[PDB]
Ligand binder design. Structure first.
Ligand SMILES: Nc1nc2c(c(=O)[nH]1)N[C@@H](CNc1ccc(C(=O)N[C@@H](CCC(=O)O)C(=O)O)cc1)CN2
Ligand SMILES: Nc1nc2c(c(=O)[nH]1)N[C@@H](CNc1ccc(C(=O)N[C@@H](CCC(=O)O)C(=O)O)cc1)CN2
Lengths: 267, 267
């Protein structure tokens, strides 16, 4: 069954930016609870503030989220020092978003989780940036798994993100995401492949439609977890329909339950 | 690449049945036109009336469609004798819906199109519609073999694996994809086709399920489908899925359609 990382608590979204500035606890609790109620397995928290305010902002977001829901945190920062300084504010282990072959991300994050039950998203990039092909992404995923192994981190705890690019930039963006996913899972059947949805549609109209269909496909290609907006009813219906279509919803009960509970459908 | 057989002109849709009984040509003319304008490659025509009226009703439908559009006909009848009696009324080669190993379907239809027409061939026989993969694959081989008897090339045939309701078999889509893989493997030049609505029988939000089934079936290798191209949401899925599969250079059909208002909010 697809693992859902709810994306909505970010500093990039203007309403969330404004709620952080205001210390608007109600808005953050409501995003937390409703993402959980829609089926999120992790609640992403991303401060998106300046460097010097990031750690305090993450701490505030984690405190408020955990008041509202027991669903575990996905700590989203591009600064491993920030992640280090907030890990202890989590009440239970969750997901770290993320590491990569860039700079010292692995050597800061992996000692911090080596021994505990934290999981980790690992992006397929390194110091030269986004890879320019499938093969490069696959080799980077291998290098990530080996590094993780040297700190005793099992492949099961790892969500490889092959950083899908925009379909407007490369019309093979999905055919290349599906190929990297097949090769990575072929080399590591216990590993998890993850993606965000939004990058795929950057540069196109009706981005929600494009995101949905990419999800519908990415699931069929083997994607195990995804960062997405589970408050998007249409997206949630497509998600659950795709779960039933891939033979993961016994007697289509979850889909039927979601409609009867008015989780999906009009409206 | 997905070849669209517009399903609208049927004798089972209450409104079209009333148009046949009322001889309301305008309605049929506008379904032919709108389905062509939406991109249909073939216009399915199905009488769905008392047997002894079927030939005359098929002829009436074929004349009105033809007068309106050059988009070729898909003659839809469960009675091969009816097909035989109306074939000469088509102004140009189209598609015949359908043959199967049931009764004398092949023995009637194949000599009819030998030396000429494309054909949908269902994977069912005198015992009914098998639900398993292996039986359907074997039935398809038998059909391709019998079609070869009349010099009908693989390229002219659209194999329909008759996908059943997901609520009746949760593996229906998985089985579709596997049948498709095997059939194509054996016959790389053939077409695989499906309708979209059977899959969602017995589930709520049928249109949602149908649209995700379409996306999945396209990635699985479906070549043609009988569907409603007047459905704004289904067309937006279809076109987003064409772009995601690498088939819409620069995403130009998707953008063009959006610009023309074809897909997206009706503003
Ligand atoms: N590891 C990893 N982490 C990530 C991303 C990834 O790729 N991989 N990409 C981002 C995923 N997070 C978001 C958060 C919000 C939006 C966003 O745009 N939200 C709108 C859009 C609404 C919608 O489409 O439903 C909103 O209004 O809430 C997109 C990605 C950042 N974190
Ligand atoms: N070879 C083959 N032929 C077939 C089918 C198939 O499987 N395979 N199945 C049927 C396909 N034709 C239709 C026509 C109309 C509808 C239908 O239900 N239409 C609604 C709703 C349209 C919509 O959902 O957008 C309407 O109001 O027009 C469903 C299947 C019969 N012909």
């Amino acid at each position: 069954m697809l693992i859902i990382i709810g994306e909505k608590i970010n500093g990039t979204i203007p309403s969330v930016k404004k709620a952080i500035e205001a210390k608007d606890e109600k808005l953050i609790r409501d995003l937390a609870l409703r993402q959980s109620e829609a089926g999120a397995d992790y609640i992403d928290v991303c401060a998106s503030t300046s460097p010097e305010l990031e750690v305090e902002t993450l701490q505030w977001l984690m405190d408020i989220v955990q008041e509202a829901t027991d669903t575990p945190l996905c700590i989203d920062s591009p600064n491993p020092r920030a992640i280090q300084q907030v890990l202890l504010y989590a009440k239970r282990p969750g997901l770290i978003n993320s590491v990569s072959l860039e700079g010292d991300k692995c050597e800061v994050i992996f000692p911090l989780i080596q021994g505990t039950s934290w999981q980790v998203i690992a992006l397929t990039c390194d110091n030269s940036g986004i890879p320019q092909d499938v093969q490069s992404r696959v080799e980077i995923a291998q290098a990530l798994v080996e590094k993780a192994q040297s700190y005793d981190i099992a492949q099961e705890r790892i969500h490889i993100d092959p950083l899908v690019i925009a379909l407007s930039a490369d019309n093979g963006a999905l055919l290349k995401f599906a190929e990297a996913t097949r090769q990575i899972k072929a080399n590591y059947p216990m590993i998890n492949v993850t993606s965000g949805l939004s990058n795929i549609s950057f540069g196109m109209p009706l981005r929600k439609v494009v995101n949905q269909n990419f999800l519908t496909l990415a699931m069929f290609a083997g994607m195990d977890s995804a960062i997405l907006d589970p408050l998007n009813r249409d997206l949630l219906a497509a998600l659950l329909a795709t779960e039933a279509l891939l033979g993961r919803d016994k007697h289509c009960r979850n889909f039927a339950n979601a409609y009867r509970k008015n989780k999906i459908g009009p409206l």
